[PDB]
Coordinates of C-alpha atoms in Angstrom, one line a residue:
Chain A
X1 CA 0.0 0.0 0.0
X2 CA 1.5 3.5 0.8
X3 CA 2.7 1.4 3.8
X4 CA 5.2 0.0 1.4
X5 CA 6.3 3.7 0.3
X6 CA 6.4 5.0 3.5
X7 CA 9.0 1.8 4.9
X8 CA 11.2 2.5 2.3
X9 CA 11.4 6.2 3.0
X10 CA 11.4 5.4 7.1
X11 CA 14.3 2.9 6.3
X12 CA 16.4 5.2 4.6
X13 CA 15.8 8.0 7.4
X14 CA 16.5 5.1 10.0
X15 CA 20.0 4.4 8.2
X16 CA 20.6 8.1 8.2
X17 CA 20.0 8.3 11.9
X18 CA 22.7 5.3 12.5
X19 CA 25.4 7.0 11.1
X20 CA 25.0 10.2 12.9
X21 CA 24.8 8.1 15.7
X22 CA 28.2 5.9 14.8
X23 CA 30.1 8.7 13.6
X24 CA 29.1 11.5 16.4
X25 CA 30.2 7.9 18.9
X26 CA 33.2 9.5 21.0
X27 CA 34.0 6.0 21.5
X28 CA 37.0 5.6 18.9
X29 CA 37.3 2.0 18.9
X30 CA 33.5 1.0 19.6
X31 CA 32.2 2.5 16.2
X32 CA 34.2 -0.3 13.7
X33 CA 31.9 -3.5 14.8
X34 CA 29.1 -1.1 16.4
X35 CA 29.1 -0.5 12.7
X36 CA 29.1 -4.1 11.3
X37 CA 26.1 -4.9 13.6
X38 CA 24.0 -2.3 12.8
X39 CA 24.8 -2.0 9.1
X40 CA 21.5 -3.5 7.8
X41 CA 18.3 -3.8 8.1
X42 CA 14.8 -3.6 7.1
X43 CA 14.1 -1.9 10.3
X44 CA 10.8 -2.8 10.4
X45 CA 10.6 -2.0 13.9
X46 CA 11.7 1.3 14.1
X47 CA 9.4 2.4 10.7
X48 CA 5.8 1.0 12.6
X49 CA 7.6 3.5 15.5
X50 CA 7.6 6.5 13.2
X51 CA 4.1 5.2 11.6
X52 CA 2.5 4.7 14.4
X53 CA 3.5 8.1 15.9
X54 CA 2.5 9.8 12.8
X55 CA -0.8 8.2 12.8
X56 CA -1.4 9.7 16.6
X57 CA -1.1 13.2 15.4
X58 CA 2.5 13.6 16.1
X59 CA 5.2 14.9 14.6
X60 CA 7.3 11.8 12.5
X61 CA 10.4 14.2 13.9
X62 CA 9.7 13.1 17.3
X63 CA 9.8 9.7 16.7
X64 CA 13.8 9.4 15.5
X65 CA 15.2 8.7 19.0
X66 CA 13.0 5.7 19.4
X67 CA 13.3 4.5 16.0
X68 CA 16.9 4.6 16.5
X69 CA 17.2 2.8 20.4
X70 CA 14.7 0.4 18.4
X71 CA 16.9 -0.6 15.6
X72 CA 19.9 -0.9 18.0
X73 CA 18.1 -3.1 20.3
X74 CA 16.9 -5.4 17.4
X75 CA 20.5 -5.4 16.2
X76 CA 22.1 -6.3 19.2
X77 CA 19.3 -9.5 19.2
X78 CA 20.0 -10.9 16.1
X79 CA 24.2 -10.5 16.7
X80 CA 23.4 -12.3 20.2
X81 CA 20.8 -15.0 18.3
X82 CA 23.3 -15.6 15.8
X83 CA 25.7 -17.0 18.7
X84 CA 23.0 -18.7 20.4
X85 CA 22.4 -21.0 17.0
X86 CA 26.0 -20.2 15.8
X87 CA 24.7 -18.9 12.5
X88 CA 27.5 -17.3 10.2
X89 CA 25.7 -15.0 7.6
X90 CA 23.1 -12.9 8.4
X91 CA 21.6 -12.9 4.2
X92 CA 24.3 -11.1 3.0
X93 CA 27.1 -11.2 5.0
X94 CA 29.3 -13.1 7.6
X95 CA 28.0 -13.0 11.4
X96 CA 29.3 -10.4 13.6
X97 CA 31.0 -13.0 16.2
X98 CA 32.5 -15.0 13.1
X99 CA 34.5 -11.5 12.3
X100 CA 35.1 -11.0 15.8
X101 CA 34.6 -13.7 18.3
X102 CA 31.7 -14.0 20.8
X103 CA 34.0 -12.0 23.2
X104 CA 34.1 -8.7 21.5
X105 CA 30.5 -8.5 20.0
X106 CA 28.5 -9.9 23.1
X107 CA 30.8 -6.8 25.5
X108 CA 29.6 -4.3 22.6
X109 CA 26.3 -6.0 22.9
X110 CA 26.6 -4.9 26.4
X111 CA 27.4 -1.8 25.3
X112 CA 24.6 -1.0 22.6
X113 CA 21.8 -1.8 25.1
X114 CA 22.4 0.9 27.7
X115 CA 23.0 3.4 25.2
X116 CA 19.8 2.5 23.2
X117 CA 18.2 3.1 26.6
X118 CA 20.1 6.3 27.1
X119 CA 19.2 7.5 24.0
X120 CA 15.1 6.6 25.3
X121 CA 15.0 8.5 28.5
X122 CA 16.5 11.6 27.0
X123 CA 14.2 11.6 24.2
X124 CA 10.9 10.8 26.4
X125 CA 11.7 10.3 29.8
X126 CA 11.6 7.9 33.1
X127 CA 8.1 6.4 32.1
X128 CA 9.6 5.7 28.4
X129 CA 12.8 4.3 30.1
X130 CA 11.4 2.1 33.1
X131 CA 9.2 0.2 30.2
X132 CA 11.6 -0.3 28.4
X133 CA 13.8 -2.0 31.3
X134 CA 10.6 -4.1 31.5
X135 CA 10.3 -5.1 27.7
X136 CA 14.1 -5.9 28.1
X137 CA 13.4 -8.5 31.2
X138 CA 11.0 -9.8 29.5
X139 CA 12.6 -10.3 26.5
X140 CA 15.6 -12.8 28.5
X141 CA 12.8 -14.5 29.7
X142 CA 11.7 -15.2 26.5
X143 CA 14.5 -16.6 25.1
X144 CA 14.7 -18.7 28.9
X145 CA 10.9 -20.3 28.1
X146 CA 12.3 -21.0 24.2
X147 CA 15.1 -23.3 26.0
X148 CA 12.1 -25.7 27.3
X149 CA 9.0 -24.8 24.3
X150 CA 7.1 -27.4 26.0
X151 CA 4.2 -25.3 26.4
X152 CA 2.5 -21.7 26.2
X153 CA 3.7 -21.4 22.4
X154 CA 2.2 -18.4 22.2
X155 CA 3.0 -16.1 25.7
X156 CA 6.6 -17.5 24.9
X157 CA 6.7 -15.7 22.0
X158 CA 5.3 -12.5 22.9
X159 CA 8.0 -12.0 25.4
X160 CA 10.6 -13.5 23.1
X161 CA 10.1 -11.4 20.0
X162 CA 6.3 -9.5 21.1
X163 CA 8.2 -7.4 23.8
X164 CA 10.2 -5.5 21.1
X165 CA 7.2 -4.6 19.2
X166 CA 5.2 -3.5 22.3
X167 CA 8.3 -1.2 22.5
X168 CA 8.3 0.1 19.3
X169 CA 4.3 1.1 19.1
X170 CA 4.4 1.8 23.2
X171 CA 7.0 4.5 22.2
X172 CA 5.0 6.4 19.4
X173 CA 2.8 6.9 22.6
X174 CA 4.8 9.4 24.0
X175 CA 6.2 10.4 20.7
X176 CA 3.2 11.2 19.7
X177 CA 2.1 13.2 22.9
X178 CA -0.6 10.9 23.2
X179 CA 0.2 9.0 26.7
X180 CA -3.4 8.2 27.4
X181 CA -3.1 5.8 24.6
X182 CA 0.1 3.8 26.7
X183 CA -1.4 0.5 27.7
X184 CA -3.7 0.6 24.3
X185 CA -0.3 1.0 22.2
X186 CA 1.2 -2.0 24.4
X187 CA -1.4 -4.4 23.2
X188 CA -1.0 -3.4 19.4
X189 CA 2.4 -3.9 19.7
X190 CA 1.7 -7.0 21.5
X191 CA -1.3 -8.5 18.4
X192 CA 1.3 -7.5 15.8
X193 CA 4.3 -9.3 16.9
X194 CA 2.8 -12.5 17.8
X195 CA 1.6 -12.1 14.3
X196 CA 4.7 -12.0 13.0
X197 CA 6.5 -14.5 15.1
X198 CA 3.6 -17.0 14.5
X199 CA 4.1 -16.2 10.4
X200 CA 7.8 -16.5 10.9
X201 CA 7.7 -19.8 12.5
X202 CA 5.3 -21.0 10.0
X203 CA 7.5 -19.8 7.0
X204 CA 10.0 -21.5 8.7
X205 CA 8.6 -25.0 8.2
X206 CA 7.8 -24.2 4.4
X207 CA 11.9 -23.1 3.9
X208 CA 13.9 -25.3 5.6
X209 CA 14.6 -28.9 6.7
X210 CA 12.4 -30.4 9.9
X211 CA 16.1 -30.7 11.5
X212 CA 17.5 -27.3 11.2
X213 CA 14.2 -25.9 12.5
X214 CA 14.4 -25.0 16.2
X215 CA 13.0 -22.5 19.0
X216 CA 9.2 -21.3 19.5
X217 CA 8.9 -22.6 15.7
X218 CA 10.0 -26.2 17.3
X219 CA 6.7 -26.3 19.0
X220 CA 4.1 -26.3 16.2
X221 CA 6.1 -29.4 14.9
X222 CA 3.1 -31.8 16.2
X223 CA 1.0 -29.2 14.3
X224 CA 3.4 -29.8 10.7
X225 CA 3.6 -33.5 11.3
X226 CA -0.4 -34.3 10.3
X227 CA -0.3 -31.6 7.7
X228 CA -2.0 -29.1 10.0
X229 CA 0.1 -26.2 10.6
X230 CA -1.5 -23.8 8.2
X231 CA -4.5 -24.4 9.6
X232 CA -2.9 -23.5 13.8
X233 CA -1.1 -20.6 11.7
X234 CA -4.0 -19.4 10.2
X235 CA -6.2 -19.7 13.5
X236 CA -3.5 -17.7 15.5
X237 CA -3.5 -15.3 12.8
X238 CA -7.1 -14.3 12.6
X239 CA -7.7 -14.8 16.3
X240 CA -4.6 -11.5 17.3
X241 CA -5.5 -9.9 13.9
X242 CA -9.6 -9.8 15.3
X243 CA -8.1 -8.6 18.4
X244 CA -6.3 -6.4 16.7
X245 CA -9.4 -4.7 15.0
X246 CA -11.2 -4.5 17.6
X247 CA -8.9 -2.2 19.3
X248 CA -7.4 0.1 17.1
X249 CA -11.2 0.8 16.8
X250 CA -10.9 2.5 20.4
X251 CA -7.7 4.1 19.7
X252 CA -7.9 8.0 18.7
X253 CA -5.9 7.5 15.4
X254 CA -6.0 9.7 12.6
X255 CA -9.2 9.3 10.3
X256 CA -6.6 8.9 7.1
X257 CA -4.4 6.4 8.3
X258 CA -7.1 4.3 9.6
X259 CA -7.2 2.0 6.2
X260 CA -3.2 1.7 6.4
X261 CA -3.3 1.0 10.1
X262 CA -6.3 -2.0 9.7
X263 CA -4.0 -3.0 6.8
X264 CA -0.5 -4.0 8.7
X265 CA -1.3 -7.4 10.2
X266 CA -1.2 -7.9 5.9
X267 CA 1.5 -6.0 5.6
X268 CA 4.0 -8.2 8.0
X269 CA 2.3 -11.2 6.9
X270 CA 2.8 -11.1 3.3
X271 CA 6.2 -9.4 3.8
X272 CA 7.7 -12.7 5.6
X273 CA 5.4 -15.0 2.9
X274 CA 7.1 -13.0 0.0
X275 CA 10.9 -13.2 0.9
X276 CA 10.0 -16.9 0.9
Chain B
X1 CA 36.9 -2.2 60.9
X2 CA 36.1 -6.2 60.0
X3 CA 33.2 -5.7 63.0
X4 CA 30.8 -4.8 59.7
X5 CA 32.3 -6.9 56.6
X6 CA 32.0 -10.2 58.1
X7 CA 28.8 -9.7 59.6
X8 CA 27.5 -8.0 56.5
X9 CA 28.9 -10.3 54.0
X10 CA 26.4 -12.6 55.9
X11 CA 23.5 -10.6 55.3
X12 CA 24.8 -10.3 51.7
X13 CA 24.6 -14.2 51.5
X14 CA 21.5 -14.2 53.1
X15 CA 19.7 -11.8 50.9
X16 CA 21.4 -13.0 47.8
X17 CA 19.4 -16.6 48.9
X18 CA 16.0 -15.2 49.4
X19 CA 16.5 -14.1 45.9
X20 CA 18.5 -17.0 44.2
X21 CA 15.0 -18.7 46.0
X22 CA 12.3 -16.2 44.4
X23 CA 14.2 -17.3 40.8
X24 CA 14.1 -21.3 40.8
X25 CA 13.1 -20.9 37.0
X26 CA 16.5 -19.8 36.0
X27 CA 18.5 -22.9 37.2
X28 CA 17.8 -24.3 34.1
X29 CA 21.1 -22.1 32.8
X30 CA 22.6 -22.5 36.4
X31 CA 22.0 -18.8 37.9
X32 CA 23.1 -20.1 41.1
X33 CA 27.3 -20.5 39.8
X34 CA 26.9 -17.0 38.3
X35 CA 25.2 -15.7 41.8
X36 CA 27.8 -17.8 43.6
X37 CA 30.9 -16.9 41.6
X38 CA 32.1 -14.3 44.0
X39 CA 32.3 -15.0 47.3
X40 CA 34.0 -12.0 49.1
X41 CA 31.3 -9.5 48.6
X42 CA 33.7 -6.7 48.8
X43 CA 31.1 -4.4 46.6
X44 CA 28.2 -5.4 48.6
X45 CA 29.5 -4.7 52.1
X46 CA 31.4 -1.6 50.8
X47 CA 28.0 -0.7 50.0
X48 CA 26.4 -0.4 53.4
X49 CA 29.6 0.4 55.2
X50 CA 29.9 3.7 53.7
X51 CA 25.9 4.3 53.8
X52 CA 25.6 3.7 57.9
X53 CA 28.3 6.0 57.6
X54 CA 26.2 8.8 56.9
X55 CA 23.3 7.7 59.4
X56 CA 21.5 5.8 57.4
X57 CA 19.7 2.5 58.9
X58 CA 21.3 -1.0 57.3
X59 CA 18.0 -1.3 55.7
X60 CA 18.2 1.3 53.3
X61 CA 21.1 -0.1 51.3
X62 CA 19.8 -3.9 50.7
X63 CA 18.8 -3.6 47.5
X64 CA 22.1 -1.6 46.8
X65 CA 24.5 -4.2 48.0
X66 CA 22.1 -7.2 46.5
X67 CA 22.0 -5.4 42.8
X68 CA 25.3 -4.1 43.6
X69 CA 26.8 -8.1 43.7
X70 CA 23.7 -9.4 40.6
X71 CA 25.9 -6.7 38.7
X72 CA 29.5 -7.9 39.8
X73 CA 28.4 -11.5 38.5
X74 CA 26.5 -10.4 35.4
X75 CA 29.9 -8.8 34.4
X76 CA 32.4 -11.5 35.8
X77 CA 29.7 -14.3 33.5
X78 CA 31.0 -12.0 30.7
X79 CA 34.1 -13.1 31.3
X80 CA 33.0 -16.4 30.8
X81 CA 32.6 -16.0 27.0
X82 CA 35.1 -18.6 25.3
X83 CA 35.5 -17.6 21.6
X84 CA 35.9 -20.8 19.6
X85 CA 38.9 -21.7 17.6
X86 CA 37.5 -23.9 15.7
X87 CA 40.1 -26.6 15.8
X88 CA 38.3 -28.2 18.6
X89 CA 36.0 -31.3 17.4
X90 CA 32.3 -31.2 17.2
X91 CA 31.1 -32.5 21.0
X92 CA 33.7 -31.0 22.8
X93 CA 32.2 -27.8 21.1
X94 CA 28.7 -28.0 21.4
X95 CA 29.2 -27.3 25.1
X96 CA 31.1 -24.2 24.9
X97 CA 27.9 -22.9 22.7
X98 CA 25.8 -24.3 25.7
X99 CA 28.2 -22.4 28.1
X100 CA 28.1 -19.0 26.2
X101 CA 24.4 -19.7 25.8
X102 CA 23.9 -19.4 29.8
X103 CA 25.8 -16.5 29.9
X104 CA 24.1 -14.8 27.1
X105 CA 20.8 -15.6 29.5
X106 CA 21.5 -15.3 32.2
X107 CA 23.5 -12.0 31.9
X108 CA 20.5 -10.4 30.0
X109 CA 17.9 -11.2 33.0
X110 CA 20.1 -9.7 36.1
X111 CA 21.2 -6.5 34.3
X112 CA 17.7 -5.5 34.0
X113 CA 16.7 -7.1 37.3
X114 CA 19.4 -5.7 39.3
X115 CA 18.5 -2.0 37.8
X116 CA 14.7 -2.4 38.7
X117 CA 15.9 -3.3 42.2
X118 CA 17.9 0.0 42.1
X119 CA 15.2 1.9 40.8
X120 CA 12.5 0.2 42.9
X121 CA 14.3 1.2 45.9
X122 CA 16.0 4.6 45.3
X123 CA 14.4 6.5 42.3
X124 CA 15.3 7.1 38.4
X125 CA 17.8 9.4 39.7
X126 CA 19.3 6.3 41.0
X127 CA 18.7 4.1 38.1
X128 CA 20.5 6.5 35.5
X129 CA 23.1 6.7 37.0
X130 CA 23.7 3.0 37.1
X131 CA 22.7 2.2 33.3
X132 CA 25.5 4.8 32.9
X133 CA 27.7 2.7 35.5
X134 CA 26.9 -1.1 33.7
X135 CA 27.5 0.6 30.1
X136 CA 31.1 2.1 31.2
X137 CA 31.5 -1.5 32.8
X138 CA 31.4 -2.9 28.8
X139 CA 33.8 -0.7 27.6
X140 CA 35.8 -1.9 30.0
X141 CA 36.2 -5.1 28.8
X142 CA 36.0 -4.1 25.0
X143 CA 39.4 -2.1 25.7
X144 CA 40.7 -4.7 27.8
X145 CA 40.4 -7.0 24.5
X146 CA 43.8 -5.4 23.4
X147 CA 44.8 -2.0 22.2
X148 CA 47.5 -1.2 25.2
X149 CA 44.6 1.7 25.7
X150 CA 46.0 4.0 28.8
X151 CA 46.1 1.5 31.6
X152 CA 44.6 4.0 34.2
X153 CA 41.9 5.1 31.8
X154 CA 41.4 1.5 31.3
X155 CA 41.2 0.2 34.8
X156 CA 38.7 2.7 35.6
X157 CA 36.3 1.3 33.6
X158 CA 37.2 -2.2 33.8
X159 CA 36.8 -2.2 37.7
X160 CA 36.3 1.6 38.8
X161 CA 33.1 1.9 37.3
X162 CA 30.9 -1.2 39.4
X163 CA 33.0 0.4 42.4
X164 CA 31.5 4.0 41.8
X165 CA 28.8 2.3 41.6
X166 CA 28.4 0.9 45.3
X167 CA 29.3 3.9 46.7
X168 CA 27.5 6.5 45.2
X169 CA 24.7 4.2 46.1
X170 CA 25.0 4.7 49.5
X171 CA 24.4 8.5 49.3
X172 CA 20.7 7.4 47.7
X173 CA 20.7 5.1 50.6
X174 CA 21.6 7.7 53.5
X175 CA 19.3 9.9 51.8
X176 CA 21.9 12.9 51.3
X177 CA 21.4 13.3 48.1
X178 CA 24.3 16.2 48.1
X179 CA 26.7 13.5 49.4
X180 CA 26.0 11.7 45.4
X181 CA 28.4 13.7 43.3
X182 CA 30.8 13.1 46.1
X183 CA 30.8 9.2 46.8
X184 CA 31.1 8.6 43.1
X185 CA 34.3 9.4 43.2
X186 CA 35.5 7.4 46.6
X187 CA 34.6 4.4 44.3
X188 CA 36.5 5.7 41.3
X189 CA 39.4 6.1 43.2
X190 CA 39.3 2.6 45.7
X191 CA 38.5 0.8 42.2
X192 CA 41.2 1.8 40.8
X193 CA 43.1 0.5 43.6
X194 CA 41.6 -2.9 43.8
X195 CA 42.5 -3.7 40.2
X196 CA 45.9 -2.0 39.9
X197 CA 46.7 -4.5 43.1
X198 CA 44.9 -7.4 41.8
X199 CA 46.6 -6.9 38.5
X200 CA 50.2 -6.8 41.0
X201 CA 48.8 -10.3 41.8
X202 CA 48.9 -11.8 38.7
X203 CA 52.6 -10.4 38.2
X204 CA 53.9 -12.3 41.3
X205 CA 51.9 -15.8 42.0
X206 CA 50.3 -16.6 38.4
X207 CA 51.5 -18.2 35.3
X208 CA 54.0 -16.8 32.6
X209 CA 52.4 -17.2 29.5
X210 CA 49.0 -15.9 31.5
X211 CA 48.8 -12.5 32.1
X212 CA 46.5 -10.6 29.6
X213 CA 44.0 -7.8 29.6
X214 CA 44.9 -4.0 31.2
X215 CA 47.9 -5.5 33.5
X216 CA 49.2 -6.8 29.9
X217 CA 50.6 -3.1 29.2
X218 CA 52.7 -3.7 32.6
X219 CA 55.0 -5.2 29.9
X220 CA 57.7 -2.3 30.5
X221 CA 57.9 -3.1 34.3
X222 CA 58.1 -6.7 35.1
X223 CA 61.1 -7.2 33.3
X224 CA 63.5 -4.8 34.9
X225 CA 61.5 -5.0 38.5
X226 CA 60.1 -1.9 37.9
X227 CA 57.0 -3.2 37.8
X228 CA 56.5 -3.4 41.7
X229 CA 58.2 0.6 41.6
X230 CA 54.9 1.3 39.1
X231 CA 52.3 -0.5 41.4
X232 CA 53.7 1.7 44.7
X233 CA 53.9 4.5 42.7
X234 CA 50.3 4.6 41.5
X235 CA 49.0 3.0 45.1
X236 CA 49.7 6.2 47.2
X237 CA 49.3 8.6 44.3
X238 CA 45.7 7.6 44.0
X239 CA 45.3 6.7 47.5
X240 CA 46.3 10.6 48.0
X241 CA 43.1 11.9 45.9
X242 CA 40.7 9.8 48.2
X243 CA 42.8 10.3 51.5
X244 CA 41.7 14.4 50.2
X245 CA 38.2 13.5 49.2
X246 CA 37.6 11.8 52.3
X247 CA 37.3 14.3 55.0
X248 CA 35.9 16.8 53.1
X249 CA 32.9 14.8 52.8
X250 CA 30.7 15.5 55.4
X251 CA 31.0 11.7 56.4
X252 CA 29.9 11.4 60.4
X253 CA 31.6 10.6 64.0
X254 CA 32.0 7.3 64.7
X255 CA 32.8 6.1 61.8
X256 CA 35.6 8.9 60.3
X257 CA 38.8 7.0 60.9
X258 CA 38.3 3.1 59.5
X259 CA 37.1 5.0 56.6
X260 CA 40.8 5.7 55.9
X261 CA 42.3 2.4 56.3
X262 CA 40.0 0.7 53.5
X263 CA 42.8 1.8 50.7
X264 CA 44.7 -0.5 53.0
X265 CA 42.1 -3.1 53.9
X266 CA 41.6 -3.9 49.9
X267 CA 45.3 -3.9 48.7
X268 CA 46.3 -6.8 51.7
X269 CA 42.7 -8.5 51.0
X270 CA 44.5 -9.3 47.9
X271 CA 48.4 -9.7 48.8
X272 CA 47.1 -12.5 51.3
X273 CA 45.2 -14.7 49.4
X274 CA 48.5 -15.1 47.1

């Protein structure tokens, strides 16, 4: 849709942002793999942070701190993931502890998240930041539950992967100047990531071998085994996506965003089909 | 002087249980050995020494001293981190990726535990400050990698920064807000201390083809004996900024003198033991 056109122009102001960030990085030495990590991206994350806040009323200016911390969080994730399952590329390039060991990048790991949540509480505050220590906790006790997927598929993976959306649309909140909408934000957030985890998992099976898969996907295998997975998939789907439509209905967003907005649980869902 | 430490390190011990309790889920990456690394609880206690000092009760700094030590292990786990070689064979390997796994976890659970604990019990005054604190903490270790980066700039980091941290902690906890600015730098300068000795430690009972890290850059001392001349030289020096700071913060009574043999206390904590 125009959701399309406006990613592509949010990316490129995303990638902008990172650079001023790197460069304007007093830290010498931190900026050469900082660099390697954050390099690219679809930064899906950070753009539903600068649409969302757009679609409050605010002003898409407002949103760049967010969007930034955002992408730098998500970053740091996928370095970290990629030494959890010892991946080496990450689609187009070798993985960040290949090039420099799992010392160096999981210390600038350590490094990336405070300053992401620097870079918050200047831009919106104590509120913003104490969330956002929450959405962090949250997110290691994700990845804990994805160690033993025996059960609760779906609350494991809105903390695994759901707590950085509910960061990115819980941000456009204050952004926006549109607190009141807070715990209303949260659950969107909350609909559209476990949307896009469950898609994720799902395009997973339809990609790769049964062996390599692994994770929260792992736990749908009794699902793929009797040929039934679309059909859990597709339940999950319209079950969040419902829930989903229901409440941006309550949600003072602008009148001309309204058909974009009902249009993204489509818009993540195709996006992950597509690439595969 | 010890009248506090022993019997605090036990209250440390005992606190760190309750919690290690509240948090059975995590032995499934075994929190407890991370928890349990460190022992001594030299942080902790010189957490609530220096808060008491200032009238405040002993309650007011146990979340300090327990987020204070969740820290000190999230960052020695780090050190855990084994990069792989690759020339090692496939089993012996998939348990290093098991072991930097549980650190990954583990690590990324604390951090944000330990600060809510800071911030649950002091304010976001408090909990700034420490985010600032952990993330000097990283670049610590991401200079200690290798780079001969200025030892004292290093160090200060590497160690200083968890030690500003239990001080400066201590003003939140005795409630003199004023006394902040000025406790931050007790720990800066202490810290210092603790490594620079520590780091003498590892140039007198450890191995030869060991030493690594900050004390690395000690290269131009330990072969000519100067390197015990450099240790001495920065000891006092340093232990002459906080000898200053010390009395002209508005500490308290009873407890003004001790206070001064701490620079002491650490540096023999550590020439004992080896």
């Amino acid at each position: 849709m125009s959701i399309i056109e406006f990613w592509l122009e949010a990316k490129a102001t995303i990638d902008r942002l990172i650079e001023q960030f790197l460069n304007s990085n007093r830290d010498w030495d931190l900026v050469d793999i900082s660099s390697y990590i954050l390099k690219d991206g679809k930064r899906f994350r950070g753009t539903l942070n600068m649409f969302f806040t757009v679609a409050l009323g605010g002003d898409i200016k407002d949103s760049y701190g967010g969007a930034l911390a955002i992408e730098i969080l998500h970053s740091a994730s996928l370095a970290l993931c990629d030494i959890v399952d010892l991946d080496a590329t990450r689609r187009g390039d070798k993985a960040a502890w290949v090039v420099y060991g799992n010392r160096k990048v999981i210390f600038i790991t350590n490094y990336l998240i405070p300053t992401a949540l620097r870079i918050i509480q200047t831009s919106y505050g104590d509120d913003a930041l104490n969330t956002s220590i929450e959405l962090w906790k949250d997110t290691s006790v994700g990845a804990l539950r994805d160690m033993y997927d025996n059960s609760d598929y779906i609350r494991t993976i809105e903390l695994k992967t759901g707590s950085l959306f509910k960061l990115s649309t819980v941000l456009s909140a204050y952004a926006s100047k549109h607190y009141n909408t807070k715990q209303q934000m949260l659950d969107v957030g909350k609909y559209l990531g476990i949307i896009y985890q469950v898609i994720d998992d799902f395009v997973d099976y339809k990609t790769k071998k049964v062996e390599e898969i692994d994770g929260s996907a792992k736990q749908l295998f009794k699902y793929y085994r009797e040929g039934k997975l679309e059909e859990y998939v597709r339940s999950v789907y319209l079950e969040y996506k419902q829930k989903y439509d229901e409440l941006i209905s309550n949600i003072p967003f602008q009148s001309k965003y309204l058909s974009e907005i009902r249009s993204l649980p489509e818009f993540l869902a195709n996006g992950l089909l597509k690439e595969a």
